[PDB]
Design a protein around this nucleic acid. Structure first.
Length: 119
DNA sequence: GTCCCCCGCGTTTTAACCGCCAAGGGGATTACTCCCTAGTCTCCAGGCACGTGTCAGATATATACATCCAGGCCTTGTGTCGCGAAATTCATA
């Protein structure tokens, strides 16, 4: 796939899938309990590109075993909570050989991260 | 990676203990008595040895009841394409 994926998780939510073209960001709650992700921050790093910061609404909770996918403006997807959300303020999550998607909670702590590395 | 929670250290508490006091409870000892049972015999019947009958579970089968599985059925997201609504560009009165 030419993009190595590094998965690390210390909480309940893991970064399930990252789009190489930056169309969407997919996270998974692999525990057996619902995770409240109110005002959690998603920071996307594309190599040396400036950070794109996405902020969730003040009250948001992902049910256990459910999938929420954050789509970009250029993707053309339709938001449908609690499973589908679209970030119209950003045309695309970006591209590059070093794509890093870090999930930041409301306390500014990194609990999940997945990095796409291409030789 | 997360986090929290003993660890080490400094400050307050406070009783551990060595010492001194006394009582006395009873443990140990001794003299006294008393009686319980091993020992002896006598006698006898109760549990072992043996044998035998016969049914509880081994053996076997057939059956009603709990489980995996899917097909049918209803509600919902997809696709479509002719035409309204907007602009456009120019012929011409």
């Amino acid at each position: 796939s030419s993009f190595s994926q590094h998965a690390r998780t210390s909480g309940r939510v893991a970064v399930e899938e990252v789009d190489e073209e930056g169309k969407f960001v997919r996270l998974r709650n692999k525990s057996n309990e619902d995770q409240s992700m109110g005002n959690w921050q998603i920071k996307r790093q594309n190599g040396d590109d400036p950070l794109l910061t996405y902020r969730f609404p003040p009250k948001f909770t992902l049910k256990a075993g459910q999938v929420v996918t954050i789509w970009a403006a250029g993707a053309g997807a339709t938001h449908s909570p609690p499973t589908d959300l679209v970030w119209k303020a950003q045309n695309t999550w970006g591209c590059g050989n070093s794509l890093r998607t870090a999930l930041i909670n409301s306390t500014g702590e990194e609990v999940a991260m997945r990095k796409l590395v291409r030789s």
